[PDB]
Amino acid sequence: AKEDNIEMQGTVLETLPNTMFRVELENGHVVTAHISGKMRKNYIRILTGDKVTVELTPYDLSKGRIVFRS
Amino acid sequence: EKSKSSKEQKKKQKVIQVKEIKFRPGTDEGDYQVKLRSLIRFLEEGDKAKITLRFRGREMAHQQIGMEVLNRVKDDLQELAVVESFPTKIEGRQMIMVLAPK
RNA sequence: GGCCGCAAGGUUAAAACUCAAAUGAAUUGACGGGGG
RNA sequence: CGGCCCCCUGGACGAAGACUGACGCUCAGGUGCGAAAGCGUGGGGAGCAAACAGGAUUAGAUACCCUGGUAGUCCACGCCG
Ligand SMILES: [K+]
Ligand SMILES: [K+]
Ligand SMILES: [K+]
Ligand SMILES: [K+]
Ligand SMILES: [Mg+2]
Ligand SMILES: [Mg+2]
Ligand SMILES: [Mg+2]
Ligand SMILES: [Mg+2]
Ligand SMILES: [Mg+2]
């Protein structure tokens, strides 16, 4: 019953405090992203230069949730 | 007798020592600038500088990130120091650059 | 802001904002580069 | 507040009486006193010692350790509170 989330790919440019990250997407836009609850429960570390999948929402195109680290 | 005197006059030359500074791949600007002032001091006093850079875990995947720090240090101390052992590969979980005065 | 002081500063003394705690004593463990 | 001696001087306590006759208790403002560091103006300076200088230790060591060392610590008068 929820609205759909578009998933994009991107690179981690910068680690910010408390599981927050600047991520450049393929389109060229930088977004501030936070780790998903699955990834933090299962201890999947994210670092600078990592490639990630970012769930975005149409309500705010400056924010995202990192849902996978390749 | 004595000559100890003459030794003291010979001693007021110099002995070179090696001062180790250790960076990391992610080290912020302020904290970089502190460690640079340590190196400037050592080199202006005529001492060698063993600049290390360590990696942990999966920081080794992004080796290129670490390399640029050592390149940044080198280019900031270009006028003061000469390079003596610019690294090639990660030996262990470390890379070691050695600088020297002038 | 007032008063005091050569100065350092002292004294009198708020509000916006933010949090659901902060705190005292005692209890059972664990820990100590404390003791036996 | 600590050697000994002299000079000036404040309070406390005990024993027996005599005397005054509630003259008391507490105190906002006020006034005084108030460790050490610190400040001003003059002195003094053995020992000690912020700052500082050198020697070390260390991944680094603007420290702890070592050799030195100025203010200060002492005196008079004032301030500070
Ligand atoms: K004031
Ligand atoms: K409050
Ligand atoms: K014990
Ligand atoms: K002196
Ligand atoms: Mg007396
Ligand atoms: Mg004093
Ligand atoms: Mg004085
Ligand atoms: Mg001394
Ligand atoms: Mg000393």
UniProtKB/Swiss-Prot annotation, chain A:
Subunit details: Component of the 30S ribosomal translation pre-initiation complex which assembles on the 30S ribosome in the order IF-2 and IF-3, IF-1 and N-formylmethionyl-tRNA(fMet); mRNA recruitment can occur at any time during PIC assembly.
A single MF term (Gene Ontology): rRNA binding
Record family assignment: Belongs to the IF-1 family.
Coiled-coil region: none
Compartmental location: Cytoplasm
InterPro entries: NA-bd_OB-fold, RNA-binding_domain_S1_IF1, S1_domain, TIF_IF1
Gene3D superfamilies: Nucleic acid-binding proteins
Protein keywords: Cytoplasm, Initiation factor, Protein biosynthesis, RNA-binding, rRNA-binding
GO CC field: cytosol
S1-like domain residues: 1-70
Name the UniProt record assigns to this protein: Translation initiation factor IF-1
Organism the protein comes from: Escherichia coli (strain K12)
Pfam families in alphabetical order: eIF-1a (PF01176)
Classification via CDD domains: S1_IF1
Role of this protein: One of the essential components for the initiation of protein synthesis. Binds in the vicinity of the A-site. Stabilizes the binding of IF-2 and IF-3 on the 30S subunit to which N-formylmethionyl-tRNA(fMet) subsequently binds. Helps modulate mRNA selection, yielding the 30S pre-initiation complex (PIC). Upon addition of the 50S ribosomal subunit, IF-1, IF-2 and IF-3 are released leaving the mature 70S translation initiation complex.
From Swiss-Prot, chain B:
GO annotation, biological process: response to cold; ribosome disassembly
The protein's name in its UniProt record: Translation initiation factor IF-3
Post-translational modification remark: Phosphorylated on threonine residue(s). The form lacking the initiator methionine is less abundant than the N-methylmethionine form.
Chain's gene name: infC
Consequence of changing residue 35 to R/L: Reduced ribosome binding
A GO CC term assigned to this protein in UniProt: cytosol
Quaternary data: Monomer. Component of the 30S ribosomal translation pre-initiation complex which assembles on the 30S ribosome in the order IF-2 and IF-3, IF-1 and N-formylmethionyl-tRNA(fMet); mRNA recruitment can occur at any time during PIC assembly.
Function according to Swiss-Prot or TrEMBL: One of the essential components for the initiation of protein synthesis. IF-3 binds to the 30S ribosomal subunit and shifts the equilibrium between 70S ribosomes and their 50S and 30S subunits in favor of the free subunits, thus enhancing the availability of 30S subunits on which protein synthesis initiation begins.
Organism name: Escherichia coli (strain K12)
Keywords of this entry: Cleavage on pair of basic residues, Cytoplasm, Initiation factor, Methylation, Phosphoprotein, Protein biosynthesis, RNA-binding
Family to which this protein belongs: Belongs to the IF-3 family.
Keyword Phosphoprotein: yes
Any GO molecular function: ribosome binding
Record localization: Cytoplasm
Misc. comment: A short form called IF-3S/IF-3 beta is found both in vivo and in vitro and is probably produced by degradation of the long form IF-3L/IF-3 alpha. The major form is the N-methylmethionine long form. Uses the non-canonical initiation codon AUU, which limits its expression.
Site positions for Important for 30S binding: 32, 35
Phenotype when changing residue 32 to F/L: Reduced ribosome binding
